[PDB]
Amino acid sequence: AKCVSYGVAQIKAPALHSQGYTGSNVKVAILDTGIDSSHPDLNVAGGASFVPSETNPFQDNSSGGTHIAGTVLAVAPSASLYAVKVLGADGKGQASWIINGIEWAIANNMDVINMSLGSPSGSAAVKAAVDKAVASGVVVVAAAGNSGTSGSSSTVTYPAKYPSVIAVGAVDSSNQRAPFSSVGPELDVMAPGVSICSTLPGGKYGALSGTSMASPHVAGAAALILSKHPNWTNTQVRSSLENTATKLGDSFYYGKGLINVEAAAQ
Ligand SMILES: [K+]
Ligand SMILES: [K+]
Ligand SMILES: [K+]
């Protein structure tokens, strides 16, 4: 990664890199607004668009998908990225498009799905598709939501709110919960999500904040773990990330805490 970011060291990814693990031979689908495949610092191995008004997955007219891609590669520099466009330039999409992306990911033997997207209400049909992905062995990671708090109510967005999905909230560089990061019993782990510098469309770079930025740290961590332990199931990868996280506070706000990929990979 050409842009410096504190998040990679924060989750202890350099310890894996020192051990010689960089996520080789791990297929990571980024279900988002596309990936700018012409960016000099990205390589994209394949993809598909399901957004009828935006038919190229290898361009990104929003910026999120590219940024997210860059984070996954900063964490797991050898991962293979797949651009699955399920959101348009406004970062919005239909539930069916998300389903078609998930199905494409299953058909094309992805190891990890990253969904940095969140609907407040969810879709029964999306649930079925994510659960199917997880049953087929895919590690499914999603942004917990940028809906802050709501007293004692959960604010975790769908599809993160489903139990089959790893819901990733955002901490800042001080390991404090970001004011926007959703909360609730469904929140699983935290990762860096404030002012994360990564790739942007048109060969650019810049900081973005959100649980969408936290999620790909965890998708990259999953790739690092699978490169060290290619025989582990998705169940085993998830368990390793949740069980070895660094506790940060009440699980309503922090889940199990900050992922620690060095501990998870032991
Ligand atoms: K490129
Ligand atoms: K969850
Ligand atoms: K929780």
Author numbering: 1 to 74, 84 to 275
Publication text:
We describe the design, kinetic properties, and structures of engineered subtilisin proteases that degrade the active form of RAS by cleaving a conserved sequence in switch 2. The engineering process to develop specificity for the RAS sequence QEEYSAM involved extensive modification of the Bacillus protease, subtilisin BPN’16–24, a canonical serine protease in which the scissile peptide bond is attacked by a nucleophilic serine (S221). The nucleophilicity of S221 results from its interactions with the catalytic histidine (H64) and aspartic acid (D32) that together form a charge relay system. To generate high specificity for the RAS target sequence, the active site was modified to be dependent on a cofactor (imidazole or nitrite) and protease sub-sites were engineered to create a linkage between substrate and cofactor binding.
The two S101K mutants are denoted as RAS-specific proteases RASProtease(N) and RASProtease(I). To understand the structural basis for specificity and cofactor activation, we determined crystal structures of RASProtease(I) alone, in complex with YSAM and QEEYSAM product peptides, and with imidazole. The structures also provide insight into the structural basis for cofactor activation by both nitrite in Protease1(N) and imidazole in RASProtease(I). In both cases, a catalytic amino acid is mutated to Gly and the vacated space is occupied by a network of conserved water molecules in the absence of the cognate cofactor. Structures of RASProtease(I) without imidazole have three conserved waters (19, 81, and 122) that interact with Oδ1 and Oδ2 of D32, CO of S125, NH of G64, Oγ of S62, and Oγ of S221. When imidazole binds, these waters are displaced, the imidazole nitrogens H-bond to Oδ1 and Oδ2 of D32 and Oγ of S221, and the charge relay system is reconstituted. RAS-specific proteases have an expanded S4 site that binds numerous solvent molecules in the enlarged S4 pocket.
